[PDB]
Write a protein that binds this ligand. Structure first.
Ligand SMILES: *C(=O)N[C@@H](CC1CCCCC1)C(=O)N[C@@H](Cc1ccccc1)C(=O)O
Length: 255
């Protein structure tokens, strides 16, 4: 019996990563962000909050290589979670956090919104794969790796995606972004106007209903001044913009 609403932040309240919004910077690395965010969450869930770490977007973005795609010029979720199963991922927090083994090297920026940071730009290079932790971090790069037991596609089924989240925690998904999506502030996003911009990868962490509209609860990787504090809701139940068609997840190995 699935509940009418579910929010992973409410189910697993000693897992702060689920609460967190990252900033992919001037880099098309959302494929990597949705993966390491959901993986961070699932490690904390899998251990009852005994292990709570920011998994390194840098390590996945820079060290996966051609298996995952083309780094900052785009990649795909399914191979991101496969990489976690094969080579694992070290820890790493936000730009200049000094959190973990490999904190993200690309500065934060303004994503389709006004604020104090520089506006995000295109054409950024993928940073180099560096298999060493920031000076003074313990343990070693190799010792800090977290591995996946498995990786898998979730079927294009609303109730299967809900059950997956409900049992195992947040997932990665991808959908088609039309230009009206860029100006999202609140409520349940449905495509009403604008042309296709491209595919986008995100973290799905729950569901609900607002004013009779069923939705998914989704985290973007565009900082907290984008959207609804960095989150959005998107129409659920109709494979809207492909939101149910590209869902990926995986079960962590106990460290
Ligand atoms: C994942 O990284 N997705 C990127 C492309 C999406 C395609 C559909 C339009 C929305 C974006 C993305 O999120 N890009 C970021 C960062 C960026 C900014 C400017 C130039 C290149 C990359 C974005 O904020 O759009």
């Amino acid at each position: 019996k699935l509940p009418a609403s579910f929010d992973a932040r409410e189910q697993w309240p000693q897992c702060p990563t689920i609460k967190e919004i990252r900033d992919q910077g001037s880099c098309g690395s959302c494929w990597a962000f949705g993966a390491v965010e959901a993986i961070s969450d699932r490690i904390c869930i899998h251990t009852n909050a005994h292990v709570s770490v920011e998994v390194s977007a840098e390590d996945l973005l820079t060290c996966c290589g051609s298996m995952c795609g083309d780094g900052c010029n785009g990649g795909y979720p399914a191979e991101a979670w496969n990489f976690w199963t094969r080579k694992g991922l070290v820890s790493g927090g936000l730009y200049e956090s000094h959190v973990g083994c490999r904190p993200y090297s690309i500065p934060p920026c303004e994503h389709h919104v006004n604020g104090a940071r520089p506006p995000c730009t295109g054409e950024g290079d993928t940073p180099k794969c560096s298999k060493i932790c920031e000076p003074g971090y313990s343990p070693t790069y190799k010792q800090d790796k977290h591995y996946g037991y498995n990786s898998y596609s979730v079927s294009n089924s609303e109730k299967d995606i809900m059950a997956e989240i409900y049992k195992n925690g947040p997932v990665e998904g991808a959908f088609s972004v039309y230009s009206d999506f860029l100006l999202y502030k609140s409520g349940v996003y449905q495509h009403v106007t604008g042309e296709m911009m491209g595919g986008h990868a995100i973290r799905i962490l729950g569901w609900g209903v607002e004013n009779g509209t069923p939705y998914w609860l989704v985290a973007n990787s565009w900082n907290t001044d984008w959207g609804d504090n960095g989150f959005f809701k998107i129409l659920r139940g109709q494979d809207h913009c492909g939101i149910e068609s590209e869902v990926v997840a995986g079960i962590p190995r106990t460290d």
